[PDB]
Design a protein around this ligand. Sequence first.
Ligand SMILES: *[C@@H]1O[C@H](CO)[C@@H](O[C@@H]2O[C@H](CO)[C@@H](O[C@@H]3O[C@H](CO)[C@@H](O)[C@H](O)[C@H]3NC(C)=O)[C@H](O)[C@H]2NC(C)=O)[C@H](O)[C@H]1NC(C)=O
Lengths: 93, 96
Amino acid sequence: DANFGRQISYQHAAVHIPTDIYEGSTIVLNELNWTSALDEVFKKNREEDPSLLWQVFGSATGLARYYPASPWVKIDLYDVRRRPWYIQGAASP
Amino acid sequence: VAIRTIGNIMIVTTLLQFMFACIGVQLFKGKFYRCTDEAKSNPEECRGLFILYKDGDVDSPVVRERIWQNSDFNFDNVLSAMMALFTVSTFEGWPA
Ligand SMILES: *[C@@H]1O[C@H](CO)[C@@H](O[C@@H]2O[C@H](CO)[C@@H](O[C@@H]3O[C@H](CO)[C@@H](O)[C@H](O)[C@H]3NC(C)=O)[C@H](O)[C@H]2NC(C)=O)[C@H](O)[C@H]1NC(C)=O
């Protein structure tokens, strides 16, 4: 797709889980249910504004769910909870 | 003939080791388990992949699996306790 230097898919959302976090645990699996209802809102937002870039939910459990789906970009050290955009919304200066 | 004379000592020392092994089982039964990364302390969270830093350097990470492993010499039962206690009597690896 254009304005997206990668290959994307609008049919669903991708979920990133950091390496140090084991997917399949009770905390992570319980997070994958109530975050599955975010995909419909993700699609609805893009329909109103087609010129919409990544929209992502950063969980306190660690996983980040973003739309549209796209494969993740050595080893991976990304943690959504340490990103500058997550930190400013988690507290005040 | 020499074995027959020393045959009485080998009965007392085998009884003493057996009693110590039974005591050792009561103390360290199943308590020698540990995870591959020294940050998880039970089998529930000792799963999946973790990031290992080679020689303690923060600039050289590497991905490794974490496994809830058991000690090679342990006190899970009397047979394992006696084998673990025999190696102690030889003074090999007993500090470990
Ligand atoms: C977390 O996982 C739950 C278990 O899979 C999901 O809950 C299940 O969702 C199914 C799909 O909606 C439901 O199936 C139908 O639900 C309707 C709505 O009430 C009912 O007609 C029936 O329950 C069912 N229809 C059938 C069987 O023909 C399941 O009922 C429902 N619950 C279960 C399986 O216990 C959750 O959706 C998921 N979390 C989120 C946020 O989606």
